[PDB]
């Protein structure tokens, strides 16, 4: 093992360095006997995700706020943590040395590092890479023969892949999500602007936009990668905003659903990859719970949508409870999955900020709020950027838990790489949500969940800046007694056996 090196740009916190020989990575896994618990901590204050060990008794000597397990009531199981391998991220990893580059994908997949299990892919340009661009540009091929994969794949998003599934500690699946079509399937024949995929659903511009999905997974099957699902586009409703500068493709919540019933659903259905999960909506929350039910509410659309993805930024503000809550309530066998959770764009924000601990706070804060709200994975935006928070071919808006100094072989863990690490380290596939009740109003945000082997496993985000006394009971073993740190993040591990 070995610790962070510390290093401060004039924000909140810190970033860790990392270079060719040197990052910070952990020893692997020990867990305790019954009676003992481990801790995970990390504060703005400097420590990141720090190991420490303590007693779990049968007394009870806190008189403070008393957080009960109920292992009992049982909720949604996760099905994993990852971010997105963009063009952007890829240059950005490809321009450190090879030795580097290795200390980077084992801090997100190995087990040495936070054990990311899901990897988002763009199906072509979209506004983080360095060129506008499709699969199929050659004008009227609608039986697109033309189809083909550019460098981008073949020689940066792929082989990059590979490497992160070898490191990989944790079966890897493969999320693929498409940002424009070509242009001369399109209304408005531009990569991006308000426009949608000529006709209507079942012409042969449709069919042809299905089979281009056929085209996508054929071309990375053939490079010995298979996917577990795909968006029916990223961001549809932002294709309907009269000129919007990312590349995009609008469907109106009716377009989406006869789509996928008419030609997506059927032409996946129909290919050899049939096993392949299609996801909705892909959007922001706030569209929720009526995309859903227009869709949904189709059996013959209904039939082919395996789960609902959201996005959602961390500066703007939106409400869990009638949006993520309402859809499941409705929609209870329709998984909720977030395929998209960035931030750092306030207009007076600088894009990148390297060692903010509150835009670290947003993400724990985030992902706690989404696991309350029955949400099953978490897909974080680029993997990488450089201190601009390019490149983007259009402007730079947002940060990213990792940063790329390419000019001087390094790159910085910034404190979001640890708060997805509270998680996604500790929260393998499978894991189930369970009760976690708490005795008093609190300051405090905290989730329980119980790992496939029966450990326990919980996570306490103190966003305030006093410190917080707390005890932790698990009816099977006993009393834990701890506190939460001001400006703190914990996980605790534990053995119920
Ligand atoms: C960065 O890695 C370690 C950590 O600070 C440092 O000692 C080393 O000199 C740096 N790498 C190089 C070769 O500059």
Redesign the pocket.
């Known amino acids: 093992a070995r610790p962070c ?1 510390p290093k401060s740009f004039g924000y909140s916190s810190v970033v860790c ?1 990392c ?4 990052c910070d990575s952990f020893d692997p896994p020990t867990f305790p006997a019954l009676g003992t618990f481990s801790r995970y901590e990390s504060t703005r204050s400097g420590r990141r995700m720090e190991l420490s060990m303590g007693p779990i008794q049968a007394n009870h000597t806190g008189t403070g706020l008393l957080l009960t397990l109920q292992p009992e009531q049982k909720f949604q199981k996760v099905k994993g943590f990852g971010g997105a391998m963009t063009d952007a991220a890829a240059l950005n990893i490809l321009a450190l040395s090879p030795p580097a580059q290795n200390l980077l994908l084992k801090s997100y997949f190995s087990e040495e590092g936070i054990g990311y299990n899901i990897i988002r892919v763009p199906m072509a340009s979209c506004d983080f890479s360095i060129r506008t661009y499709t699969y199929a540009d050659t004008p009227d091929d609608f039986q697109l023969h033309n189809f083909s994969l550019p460098e981008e794949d073949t020689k940066l998003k792929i082989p990059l892949i590979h490497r992160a599934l070898q490191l990989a500690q944790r079966p890897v699946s493969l999320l693929a999500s498409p940002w424009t079509s070509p242009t001369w399937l399109k209304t408005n024949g531009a990569v991006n602007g308000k426009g949608s995929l000529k006709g209507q659903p079942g012409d042969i511009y449709h069919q042809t936009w299905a089979r281009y999905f056929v085209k996508f997974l054929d071309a990375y099957a053939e490079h010995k990668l298979q996917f577990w699902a795909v968006t029916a586009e990223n961001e549809p409703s932002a294709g309907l905003l009269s000129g919007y500068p990312f590349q995009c493709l609008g469907f109106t919540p009716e377009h989406q659903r006869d789509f996928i019933a008419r030609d997506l659903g059927p032409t996946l259905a129909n290919s050899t990859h049939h096993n392949v999960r299609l996801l909705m909506l892909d959007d922001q929350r706030l569209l929720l719970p009526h995309w859903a039910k227009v869709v949904l509410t189709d059996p013959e659309a209904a039939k082919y949508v395996h789960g609902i993805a959201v996005h959602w930024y961390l500066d703007f503000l939106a409400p869990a409870k009638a949006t993520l809550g309402e859809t499941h309530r409705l929609f209870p066998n329709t998984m909720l999955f977030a395929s998209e959770a960035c931030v750092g764009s306030k207009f007076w924000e600088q894009s990148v900020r390297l060692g903010s601990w509150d835009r670290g706070m947003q993400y724990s804060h985030s992902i706690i709020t989404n696991l309350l709200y029955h949400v099953v994975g978490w897909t974080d935006w680029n993997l990488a950027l450089n201190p601009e928070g390019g490149p983007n071919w259009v402007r730079n808006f947002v940060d990213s838990p990792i940063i790329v100094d390419i000019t001087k072989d ?1 790159f910085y863990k910034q404190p979001m790489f640890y708060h997805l690490g509270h998680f996604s380290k500790f929260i393998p596939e499978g894991s189930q949500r369970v009760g976690l009740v708490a005795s008093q109003k609190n300051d405090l945000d905290a989730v329980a969940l119980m790992h496939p082997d029966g450990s326990a496993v919980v996570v306490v985000l103190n966003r305030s800046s006093k410190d917080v006394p707390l005890t932790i009971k698990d009816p099977a073993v006993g009393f834990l007694e701890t506190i939460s740190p001001g400006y703190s993040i914990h996980t605790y591990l534990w053995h119920r056996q």
């Not at 270079?19 to 040197?22: I, V």
């Open positions: 090196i360095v270079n060719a020989t040197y390094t």
